[PDB]
UniProtKB/Swiss-Prot annotation, chain A:
Protein name: Eukaryotic translation initiation factor 4E
Species this chain originates from: Saccharomyces cerevisiae (strain ATCC 204508 / S288c) (Baker's yeast)
Gene name, Swiss-Prot/TrEMBL: CDC33
Compartment annotation: Cytoplasm; Nucleus
GO CC terms in record: cytoplasm; cytoplasmic stress granule; eukaryotic translation initiation factor 4F complex; nucleus; ribosome
First and last residues shown, out of full length: 35 to 213 of 213
Keywords, comma-separated and alphabetical: Cytoplasm, Initiation factor, Isopeptide bond, Nucleus, Phosphoprotein, Protein biosynthesis, RNA-binding, Translation regulation, Ubl conjugation
Subunit structure of this chain's protein: Component of the eIF4F complex, which composition varies with external and internal environmental conditions. It is composed of at least eIF4A (TIF1/TIF2), eIF4E (TIF45) and eIF4G (TIF4631 or TIF4632). Interacts with PAT1 in a RNA-dependent manner. eIF4E is also known to interact with other partners.
Known function: Recognizes and binds the 7-methylguanosine (m7G)-containing mRNA cap during an early step in the initiation of protein synthesis and facilitates ribosome binding by inducing the unwinding of the mRNAs secondary structures.
Superkingdom to which the source organism belongs: Eukaryota
Swiss-Prot record, chain B:
Function: Acts as an inhibitor of cap-dependent translation. Competes with eIF4G1/TIF4631 and EAP1 for binding to eIF4E/TIF45 and interferes with the formation of the eIF4F complex, inhibiting translation and stabilizing mRNA. Binding affinity for eIF4E/TIF45 is 10-fold less than that of eIF4G1/TIF4631. Required for induction of pseudohyphal growth in response to nitrogen limitation, probably by regulating STE12 translation.
Phenotype upon changing residue 7 to A: Reduces interaction with eIF4E/TIF45. Prevents pseudohyphal growth. Further reduces interaction with eIF4E/TIF45
Subunit structure: Interacts with TIF45.
Protein name: Cap-associated protein CAF20
Domain of life: Eukaryota
Protein family membership: Belongs to the CAF20 family.
Originating gene: CAF20
Localization annotation: Cytoplasm
Length: 173, 46
């Protein structure tokens, strides 16, 4: 019994540097790929949950032909700051992954990133879309997936803002 | 032309089940635990 996904996906892990010199190495590594629902759940069962990860960790789940990286690429990211929802990070992350691999968040969606950081964890949904009309629909659906009833947790950053030291979102929901 | 398969969140949960994986899950965990050990030793908690 196999339930195929629309596309194959790869899980990547960004390991925190424990030495200064490790910042000169490639700490972003592919972990495994999957292309069925069953393969997805086997992976989830066998990797640490988000809340257990060390600071500066990232998980990236991207379509197989997409590496998790220009500033002048098209689109941007919907960034979700957990804030007061932080206790629920594992379930919110899993629901976000299901919305993505199940293709119900989407009109396209390239991948999603989990970032563990001091002071606050976040997710980022990377899209190739530019126009506010699809971006608002994506952000609204993402907000529903996360069961958020307040404003302020979601910020859309165009790819161009990546070059900045103080990037500013063009949409906040 | 177009092609697509969609699954709802509930559908995907209904398909959730020792489950075999294609990577070394023991080593992956060990790397992460070693990082946490070193972070704990290096952060000054007091
Ligand atoms: Zn748990
Ligand atoms: Zn201690």
């Amino acid at each position: 019994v196999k339930h195929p996904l629309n596309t194959a996906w790869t899980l990547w892990y960004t390991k925190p540097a424990v030495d200064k010199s490790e910042s000169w190495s490639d700490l972003l590594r592919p972990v495994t790929s999957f292309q069925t629902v069953e393969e997805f759940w086997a992976i989830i069962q066998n990797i640490p949950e988000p809340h257990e990860l060390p600071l500066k960790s990232d998980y990236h789940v991207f379509r197989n032909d997409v590496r998790p990286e220009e500033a002048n690429a098209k689109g941007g990211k919907w960034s979700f700051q957990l804030r007061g929802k932080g206790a629920d990070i594992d379930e919110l992350w899993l629901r976000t992954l299901l919305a993505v691999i199940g293709e119900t968040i989407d009109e396209q969606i390239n991948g999603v990133v989990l970032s563990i950081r001091k002071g606050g964890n976040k997710f980022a949904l990377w899209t190739a879309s530019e126009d506010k009309e699809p971006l608002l629909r994506i952000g609204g659906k993402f907000k529903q997936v996360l069961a958020l009833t307040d404003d302020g947790h979601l910020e859309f950053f165009p790819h161009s803002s990546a070059n900045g030291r103080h990037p500013q979102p063009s949409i906040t929901l | 032309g177009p092609h697509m398969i969609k699954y709802t969140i509930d559908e995907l949960f209904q398909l959730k089940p020792t489950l075999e994986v294609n990577f070394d899950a023991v080593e992956f965990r060990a790397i992460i635990e070693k990082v946490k050990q070193l972070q704990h030793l290096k952060e000054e908690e007091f």
